Scaffold this motif. Structure first.
Motif, PDB file in Angstrom:
ATOM      1  N   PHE A  49      -3.138   3.337  -6.673  1.00 21.44           N
ATOM      2  CA  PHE A  49      -4.513   3.056  -6.280  1.00 21.44           C
ATOM      3  C   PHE A  49      -5.473   3.608  -7.325  1.00 21.44           C
ATOM      4  O   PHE A  49      -5.167   4.592  -8.011  1.00 21.44           O
ATOM      5  CB  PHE A  49      -4.839   3.678  -4.917  1.00 21.44           C
ATOM      6  CG  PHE A  49      -4.260   2.925  -3.754  1.00 21.44           C
ATOM      7  CD1 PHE A  49      -4.809   1.711  -3.356  1.00 21.44           C
ATOM      8  CD2 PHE A  49      -3.147   3.407  -3.078  1.00 21.44           C
ATOM      9  CE1 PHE A  49      -4.274   1.006  -2.283  1.00 21.44           C
ATOM     10  CE2 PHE A  49      -2.610   2.707  -2.008  1.00 21.44           C
ATOM     11  CZ  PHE A  49      -3.175   1.507  -1.606  1.00 21.44           C
ATOM     12  N   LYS A  83      -7.694   4.208  -1.827  1.00 21.13           N
ATOM     13  CA  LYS A  83      -6.444   4.212  -1.069  1.00 21.13           C
ATOM     14  C   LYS A  83      -6.740   4.312   0.415  1.00 21.13           C
ATOM     15  O   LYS A  83      -6.285   3.493   1.213  1.00 21.13           O
ATOM     16  CB  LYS A  83      -5.597   5.427  -1.457  1.00 21.13           C
ATOM     17  CG  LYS A  83      -4.276   5.535  -0.706  1.00 21.13           C
ATOM     18  CD  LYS A  83      -3.673   6.938  -0.764  1.00 21.13           C
ATOM     19  CE  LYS A  83      -3.779   7.548  -2.144  1.00 21.13           C
ATOM     20  NZ  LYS A  83      -2.975   8.805  -2.264  1.00 21.13           N
ATOM     21  N   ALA A  91       0.826  -1.197   0.000  1.00 22.92           N
ATOM     22  CA  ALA A  91       0.000   0.000   0.000  1.00 22.92           C
ATOM     23  C   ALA A  91       0.860   1.248   0.000  1.00 22.92           C
ATOM     24  O   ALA A  91       0.536   2.233  -0.675  1.00 22.92           O
ATOM     25  CB  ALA A  91      -0.937  -0.003   1.213  1.00 22.92           C
ATOM     26  N   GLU A 107      -8.395   8.043  -4.581  1.00 25.49           N
ATOM     27  CA  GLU A 107      -8.018   8.500  -3.249  1.00 25.49           C
ATOM     28  C   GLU A 107      -8.882   7.852  -2.181  1.00 25.49           C
ATOM     29  O   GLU A 107      -8.390   7.479  -1.114  1.00 25.49           O
ATOM     30  CB  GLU A 107      -8.143  10.024  -3.157  1.00 25.49           C
ATOM     31  CG  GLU A 107      -7.025  10.774  -3.845  1.00 25.49           C
ATOM     32  CD  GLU A 107      -5.726  10.696  -3.074  1.00 25.49           C
ATOM     33  OE1 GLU A 107      -5.763  10.832  -1.833  1.00 25.49           O
ATOM     34  OE2 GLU A 107      -4.668  10.500  -3.708  1.00 25.49           O
ATOM     35  N   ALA A 144       0.787   4.102  -2.836  1.00 24.59           N
ATOM     36  CA  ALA A 144       0.545   5.508  -2.517  1.00 24.59           C
ATOM     37  C   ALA A 144       1.621   6.398  -3.125  1.00 24.59           C
ATOM     38  O   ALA A 144       1.329   7.475  -3.652  1.00 24.59           O
ATOM     39  CB  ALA A 144       0.468   5.718  -0.993  1.00 24.59           C
TER      40      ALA A 144
END
Ligand SMILES: [Zn+2]
Ligand SMILES: [Zn+2]
Length: 509
Positions: free
Chosen positions: A66, A72, A57, A69, A61
């Motif tokens: 992703f 994510k 992740a 937003e 980011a």
């Protein structure tokens, strides 16, 4: 709920089921009961699946990987939440759900055999608690014991057999360690001792470990399953809800790779879950060699969080909520089914009925089946132990179910490395064979006195519950009468042995 494999939370019987267990035939009264149960729901075993997916992740980011937003934020929230729940509980520990599972099973064990235990309280009958010696199994037992005692108002507390080899001197003091019957699958016992070479227990465990390590059919079938193209497709499908095509394409061609370290790289250092104290919870620090190097790895890690999340239902609350089920809705539920098959297949081949032409995978449960019968004999033969409650593992239940021929465990796979176990060709499922807190219980009743026709005592009779559903014994067994789920002890000794012979007319009362 859905496709939780052997992480399926225990399904307690409803009031209708628990109130409708069959009555023993006229003249028969309770003399014994016994059980073996898998430990309850546990958290993640270590900072690993949650660790690796957070490292992934962080890279997504940084690299704009992703899909949005909001996506994510939600993914990171889910991961942080399950990690926080585990840090608080302690990695590997029983969850609130796991405690409740055993508490309820214990309550209902007293309730179903109220007459037996009220007589025991008056006549000095004793209860034996046993575990493998592994802490989560013992702790599951401790919750069963608490539930049993609450249901009986403490009236059996003075009726517990003192162990000759207790699990520990504290909360587990009532539990006798018996790894020959509750940890028969390994030479190394959970308490740090080992089975003694030259004994039956040692050979059973050692021959089994050597068998599964070196068997060509199991190895070939597992390769076939590991290479399954549809599981790979499902892996991509699952991850595409969260990550961009461009990000996942870099993963699939080796540009991305995450290790279980401080920065997700091989040169990173040993890591620890946020907020955890490494000295008090060593399992909060994962092994650095653990890795994600493909979509399969990431998706199976995400699936593992989904199924453990179900087991951590009680911890899914307040300041540490998580919602992994949102990734397995609609068409994605069919992906969960694929991942469940991948997990079930490994257990099936290594620990369950496995492939046709062998019984090495489950014959190991014989010491437990032997003890199920032997403890009945001890009671019938004048002993004071009215119940034996045992607590163990999936590695205990899976072969035990296969050896007994319980529903779900009656079908071996073809003797083939290509024509393998699938959901289409086999009834075996982790969710039904060995859910969390899976258990087998037998009740034994007897008719008093000497049969005037034989001048001998009447044969005791036995009835089985599997996950608290009343079930017949395997089809070769003949019950005491048409339409009955009770069986003579003599009949079980014959029909549960490897030849599965029935005594026929002599099985009838
Ligand atoms: Zn908390
Ligand atoms: Zn795609």
């Amino acid at each position: 709920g859905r496709y939780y494999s052997s992480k399926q939370p225990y399904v307690a019987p409803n009031d209708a089921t628990a109130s409708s267990y069959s009555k023993a035939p006229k003249g028969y009264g309770p003399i014994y009961t016994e059980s073996m149960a898998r430990h309850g729901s546990r958290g993640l075993s270590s900072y690993k699946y949650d660790a690796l997916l957070m490292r992934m992740a962080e890279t997504a980011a940084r690299d704009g990987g992703f899909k949005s937003e909001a996506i994510k934020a939600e993914f990171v929230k889910n991961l942080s939440g399950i990690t926080a729940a585990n840090v608080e509980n302690g990695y590997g520990m029983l969850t609130g759900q796991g405690a409740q599972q055993h508490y309820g099973i214990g309550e209902r064990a007293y309730q179903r055999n109220r007459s037996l235990f009220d007589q025991a309280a008056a006549d000095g009958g004793t209860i034996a608690y046993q575990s493998s010696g592994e802490a989560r199994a013992t702790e599951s037992g401790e919750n069963f014991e608490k539930g049993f005692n609450e249901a009986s108002g403490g009236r059996l507390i003075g009726n517990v057999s003192a162990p000759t080899n207790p699990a520990d001197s504290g909360n587990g003091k009532d539990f006798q360690k018996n790894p020959d019957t509750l940890y028969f699958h390994k030479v190394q016992n959970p308490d740090g001792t080992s089975k003694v070479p030259g004994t039956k227990a040692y050979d059973i465990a050692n021959n089994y470990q050597n068998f599964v390590a070196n068997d060509a059919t199991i190895a070939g079938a597992e390769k076939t399953i590991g290479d399954n193209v549809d599981v790979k497709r499902a892996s991509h499908d699952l991850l595409s809800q969260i990550f961009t095509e461009e990000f996942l394409a870099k993963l699939e061609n080796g540009e991305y790779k995450w290790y279980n370290t401080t920065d997700g790289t091989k040169k990173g250092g040993k890591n620890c879950a946020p907020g955890a104290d490494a000295s008090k919870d060593p399992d909060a620090c994962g092994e650095v060699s653990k890795k994600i190097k493909s979509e399969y790895d990431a998706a199976m890690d995400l699936y593992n969080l989904y199924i453990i999340a179900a087991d951590m239902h009680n911890e899914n609350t307040g300041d540490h909520t998580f919602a992994f089920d949102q990734y397995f809705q609609g068409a994605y539920a069919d992906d969960a089914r694929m991942f469940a098959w991948a997990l079930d297949a490994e257990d099936f081949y290594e620990k369950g009925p496995s492939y046709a032409g062998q019984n090495e995978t489950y014959s190991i449960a014989q010491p437990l089946l032997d003890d199920f019968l032997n403890t009945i004999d001890a009671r019938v033969n004048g002993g004071s132990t009215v119940a034996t409650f045992r607590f163990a593992h999936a590695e205990t239940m899976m072969p035990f179910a296969a050896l007994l021929g319980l529903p779900g465990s009656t079908q071996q796979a073809p003797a083939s490395t290509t024509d393998v176990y699938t959901y289409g060709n086999n009834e075996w499922r982790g969710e039904s064979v060995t859910p969390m807190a899976a258990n087998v219980q037998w009740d034994v009743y007897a008719r008093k006195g000497e049969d005037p026709a034989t001048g001998q005592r009447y044969t005791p009779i036995v009835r089985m519950l599997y996950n608290e559903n009343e079930v017949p014994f395997r089809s070769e067994c003949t019950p005491v009468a048409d339409g009955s789920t009770w069986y003579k002890l003599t009949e079980l000794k014959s029909c549960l042995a490897a030849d599965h012979k029935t005594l026929g007319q002599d099985a009838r009362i």
